[model samples]
Target: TTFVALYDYESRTETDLSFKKGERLQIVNNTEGDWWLAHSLSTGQTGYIPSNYVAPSDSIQAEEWYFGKITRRESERLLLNAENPRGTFLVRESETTKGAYCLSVSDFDNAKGLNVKHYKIRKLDSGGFYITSRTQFNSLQQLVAYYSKHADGLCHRLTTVCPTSKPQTQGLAKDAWEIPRESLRLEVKLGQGCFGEVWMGTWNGTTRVAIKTLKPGTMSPEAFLQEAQVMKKLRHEKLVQLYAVVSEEPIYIVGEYMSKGSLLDFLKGETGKYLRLPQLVDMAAQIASGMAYVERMNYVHRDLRAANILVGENLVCKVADFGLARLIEDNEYTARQGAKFPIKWTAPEAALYGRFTIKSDVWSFGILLTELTTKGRVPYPGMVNREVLDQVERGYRMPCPPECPESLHDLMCQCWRKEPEERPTFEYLQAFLEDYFTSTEPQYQPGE
Candidate 1:
């Protein structure tokens, strides 16, 4: 098989052009079409020729090579070494193979230097004058891929550097967590997640984007597969925008950046510290709204905790952390009889057995309110889920925090009700919080 581009055989003073079918030449380097515009290869004539007119030949004739030499430098940076040497092929690059793979020829012992000529070779392995040719990028990529397969202990370009064959121009992977600034044409970190770091970038000068690069091999393949599937279809204003996923060697999941850190951080920090109970209720309302949206989409945030919530620059709360929230199509829950999920913020039933429901989410919401109220104290401090369940199992109950007003206290009691049906839906909670906040200022007692 043959491809067309720029080619130089051994003993040839200059580069030659290969053309396509039904094509003619006028001059070599003419500026229009054809392999060469100004001069011709055979008759010195040149004209526009279809690109398919010629094919690359992989033959090894010593007369085909022009000259040879040997040279070295500090390392293999394009400009740092031998770019301006005379009778040294062209540069450290032109002196080597077609695409300038550095290792195949280091120039140690060639009387002069390694020969600059095309040779019929299967692969570029160790030993005398590794074969270098002006091959198509795909073909070159195949070579690189092969090398990567067998490489061991510092193989130069294969690992440390990228091949020219896979130029930065083709496309910058949008799913890459942190792409090179030059490739995507932007400068900003998008966000950070449990297993990856995300950054903003530009590609092809078309659209600005965020890229995520996942930590290598940290996530189990099953988890990775689920994450990819869920994020691809999850679309909501309250959720982060998932633009794309890069499933290559290092996986990545790119999405929108909130600019601000996270809702958990924002809600509990000094900036929002001054927010009143009503304001806290409003934030909780937003969280409920987002959670309701996810429920409608048939996803239960199994790990619905403060860290997973996100507060936007606009102070809007976005319920997030779907990384563990599986996309379960049927009504059947994934857990068996008694599946234990995240207990701290989970419903009593969820913790007792491996079972969860939207009502269980309501219980989590009540705990979230506790988080908001105490600026993050446990719901019924010093009590674990089992203890709370024991109390709930008997006639004991989640006592409203001592500092909480009777109305908020009553709501908390209603939330942790043993019966799931007894718990209020997010819609009811939203309305209640809205009215309660509007009615009374959240009175802060002596101690939280």
Candidate 2:
């Protein structure tokens, strides 16, 4: 049986025969423990390798057009490319319907905004596949080939198979918290702030990072450095990693390099225009997902906004700057050293009384959704900070963003409920978006 190595195998104690990543091997037998008795296709050698290191090669999951376990959010993003023209489609495991698959097609029709449509693919008991009962096929391959030639019962004939692939990276190292200043060489400037400028830096000639520097100003170096320990502990794939911190005269925060930069910057830029309603909701969902983790840890991101979030490859958005946001956490509240905050994104309770909580994050989450739907428009665009403060204090909230569906806009509004206790928790919001996206999606085409 063919299998592919997910990572390099280099344990001499396990076996002398080691394999490189992306190497193919045949599983003579799965040892049923840690190691697998396998023969490498390239070296023509046999040895025992870690079973977890390799993934079983299959006829379906291995196919380029078949994306495994990606949500409808991600699948739509994969097909929303200029490179992927009309009739491009991909088959992915369904998010809502278990033990089933979905066909996401790029049908550029104005009737259905964004032009991407999804169809559920079902299997017959006899082992045949069908999109419509009008037609059934012995194999999925035959279905694809037949649809490629004629649109017997689909929105569009299959022309191209989406060529999206997974990304690879060097995961966090064992001793990643304390990076030596000498090893991290700062490069081009990435962002600027009152504290210091952020630079695109590298670690030991590898692992790109956004190096945040502190100029040793108003905030004492010792106090600012203390939080690095706590920051290192709050790690998640959706949360920007505090890879390393240089605790000395000048502090340097070696962070994961998010290629797309801030989510605000992304929404304001050219690429942002391509975003659809579902993707916008998905971004908000992504933030709530990460925020739920922070909520679970009982810490508040005092400053939560689109600008603080960073997007990486594959439209993956991550929460960032929480390290500074929680400069020094207190008992159920974080009193960050600050005179004022991002007035627009701040909740009334937090900005007014310095009372920050996970619910306040939910409030900013509301503003963030507006920023997303409005293509990064400034919150309370016509009002100044003082005006914004006055308006919000008087029970005023910003109107729903343009083209934002009532359902999504309603969710945004719920986050702004005056009482923190009344707002929906991040945990609930995460589940809501998942169910919302799936349930609202149109079922199989009527004609089909």
What is each predicted model's overall lDDT from 0 to 1?
Answer: 0.49, 0.76
After TM-score superposition, what is the CA distance of residue 328 in candidate 2 from its true location, in Å? 4.5
Clash counts for all predictions: 40, 0
lDDT of 1 by residue, 1-448 (tens): 2223222211111233334321223443435332333334444543333232333334111111211121222122211223312112211222333533333212223463432211222333432222333332233334444444543222122322211111111112212333333444446775676555667764446445556565665555456666667655666546665655545536655455555666566766786668777567767766776777776777676767676676764355777656444432222324411223345676767767756788888888877777776766555677764466666567565666656677776787777788999888777876676456342322111111
Which window of ten consecutive residues has the lowest lDDT sum in model 1? Answer: 162-171
Error of 1 at 386 (Å): 7.5
The candidate scoring highest on TM-score is 2
lDDT tens readout by residue for model 2, 400-437: 67787888788888999989899999999988975675
